[PDB]
Amino acid sequence: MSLEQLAGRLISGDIGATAVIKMTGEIIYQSPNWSVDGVHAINVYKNREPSIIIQGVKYSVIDVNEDRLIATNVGGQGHIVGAVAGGKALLIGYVSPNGDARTAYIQIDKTARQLSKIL
């Protein structure tokens, strides 16, 4: 199914927003309830930077590598969780502060694996 459908269907439970970002920084799709800086986000991933800022909220990067990004706002405003779709795009999700970023990562990685086949 479509890019919008795969990324959009992730918005359930603890996951509140999603964005699919090419390795260039180009946003292929993002849910309409937010607006991510794609170049900033992809550089945090690529360069393993210590924080990611989305819409004025600083999320401290607590785990980052070729396949995963976990960042948490220390003040309690939530998490950013990223997985990679076959080295072609970064799929990120906003996760509610009470949600576990680990289980969110499992779901986001599953969707990233599906996205890889249509990119």
Next chain:
Amino acid sequence: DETTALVCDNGSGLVKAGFAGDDAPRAVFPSIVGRPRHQGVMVGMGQKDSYVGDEAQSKRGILTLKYPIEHGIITNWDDMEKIWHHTFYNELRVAPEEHPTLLTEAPLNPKANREKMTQIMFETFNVPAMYVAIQAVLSLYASGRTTGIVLDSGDGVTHNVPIYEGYALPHAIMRLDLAGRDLTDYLMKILTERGYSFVTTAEREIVRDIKEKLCYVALDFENEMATAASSSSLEKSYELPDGQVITIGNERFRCPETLFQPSFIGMESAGIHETTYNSIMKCDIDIRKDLYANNVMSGGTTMYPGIADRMQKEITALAPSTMKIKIIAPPERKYSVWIGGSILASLSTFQQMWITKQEYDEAGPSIVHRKCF
């Protein structure tokens, strides 16, 4: 139950093994493999006989003994397989193919080692499910929290591990190859100054016992040295296996002082107090307060009387003047890694994170990187 999850915590010196949901490990035994002497290199000779743990030590006169884990890292995989086989069949008496198995690892364990553990568990032992966790992360969890900085010190390695929500923080982990075995060796050395002659492997084991029974960390080292010089108040008697008694004085506190002054054994590293501070400073500015407030000690080499109070003093001197600092030193801390594993493996919300055999079959050994973080 027929299929209860297993918890194995593999250390440089000791294996701690048992069943998820138990309060303590059922089996604690030395992480050693003994193979017949002079048969390691011999014409037409295979490696058919081997012994593990306490049996290897009992037969030391006919075996060459080796430690498969060095400074917390698996370095001899053939012998490590023997440790695991012994754990399942001889210590726990289970069929590994019938039990999910949670294992532990050092922080910064290389990718190849993580994959090899996973491969061995699925392909050799045919476990139905597996998980691996960082030792310090388990100890922290055992203390009832997921944010803090762990001082983990065992037989082979010491780490400072700052952790936030169960994640060991990027760039901030410190490894120091100074731990219990080095402290035993140092105690043998300084007892020579008193006119004793501890040298052999058997004598090393006696000194390990002296260390565990009589050593402590001085609150102020120079003051303690002055007390030991002026009087006999700190001196203690120790009875050797043959019945002879010796006296130990300032060696009681000079031995573990090495943790705070690694120069005692010619190491250039700063002491564990300073490496704690340095680790905290490599973490996000907004996380540091919570790390200072949650210093957790784990491992056998954190058992010295006085160590928590010494750490409180030393960290207070390094930290900002108003910083709230707390050292948590659980009485159970020689087994807190294992206990953390037991609690985690029994937790309802953890069960989804087991790596299943099916997942291993689909993804291969790198499945460990997908699920164990």
